């Protein structure tokens, strides 16, 4: 069973990729009921570059075809307490994102769920929380509110709401 993302223009199947990391922003000003909220990064290309886990492909919110960590998910930040610094998540096992050529790119739901579960586990240990909530982008240009990527010289845009709306106890 898949998480089937709508994308525009339709990416061709040759633009399918491996998801190797992602980049997050922690919601600011939260009273925190033992709860921490994260969204795809509200930062720009510089936030992405500073993670230093990208490969050749230029992409937002998700790193495509980048470097993997060796044994476990690794989360990094230049200052965990600063909500204006993004959080760099590097996967240890990639998540395939397969594009149909007809306007969607699909991800295995069970694999994505298990990846988030691992990311939540590392965040929880960083922030000493219990409940980790992923929520969608709170706004931005099309490149940053969507999962965006340059494939073959053309820019494609996938709504990522389905990837960041879940709770993890």
């Amino acid at each position, epitope marked *: 069973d898949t998480i089937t993302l709508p994308c525009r223009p339709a990416p061709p199947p040759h633009c399918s990729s491996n998801i190797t990391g992602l980049i997050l*922003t*922690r*919601q*600011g*000003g*939260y*009273s925190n009921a033992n709860t921490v*909220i994260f969204r795809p*990064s*509200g*930062g*720009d*290309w*510089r*936030d992405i570059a500073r993670c230093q886990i990208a490969g050749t492909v230029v992409s937002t919110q998700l790193f495509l075809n980048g470097s993997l960590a060796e044994e476990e998910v690794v989360i990094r930040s*230049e*200052d965990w*307490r*600063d*909500n*204006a*610094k*993004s959080i760099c998540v590097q996967l240890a096992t990639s998540v395939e994102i397969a594009c149909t050529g007809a306007g969607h790119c699909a991800i295995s739901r069970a694999k994505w769920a298990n990846t988030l579960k691992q990311i939540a586990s590392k965040l929880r240990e960083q922030y000493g929380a219990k409940t980790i909530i992923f929520k969608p*982008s*709170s*706004g*931005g*240009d099309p*490149e*940053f*509110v969507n999962h965006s990527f340059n494939c073959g010289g053309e820019f494609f845009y996938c709504a990522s709401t389905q990837l960041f709306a879940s709770t993890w106890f």
Partner: antibody
Amino acid sequence: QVQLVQSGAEVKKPGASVKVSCKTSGYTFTDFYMHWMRQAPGQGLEWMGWINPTGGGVNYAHKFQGRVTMTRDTSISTAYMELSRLTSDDTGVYYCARSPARELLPLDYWGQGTLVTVSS
Amino acid sequence: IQVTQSPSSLSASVGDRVTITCRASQGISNYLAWYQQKPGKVPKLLIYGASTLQSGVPSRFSGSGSGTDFTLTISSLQPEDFATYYCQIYETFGQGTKVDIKR
């Protein structure tokens, strides 16, 4: 020199929305983050959120998440804050202020403030 | 991060020394700033990094502290210093301290 200039005072009925502008100059607009703060009359300062001017991504204070919208127009080096579903609790002075990019601490230059009055 | 700023108000005379403190609910390195605000005026940055004066701020102002406890010190109050002071720790502002004139 560095100059943040905000739009004039606003008067609103409850349930309305307000949009305040912050026009900047004297610096490279995309090199710094922009934050919004407000101050209810006689009360303290509170942070509303920041906006990344290069890409427009935002991080709103949880308290305002869902009814504030921050945007910018880089071509005129201007930031905007729109607050919706206003109630009299939103009466106060609203400030834009500049920080270094990817920082929340040093708000070195501020707008002059915009009074927003929400009343029937 | 939670912040408790003390005292909410104090009164003092021109020339004497006043101390304003800001406590954080966890260690914050020196990620703190102090601002001054006078009635009807815009907040003004005085100190950031907990102890770095902003350029042109007079020498009577200093900040110190690390971890969770931070202090703004005005070594000898001038008349222009009677005003409200706020600490800022990441996105949290302190409750404010108003400095009144003793008479």
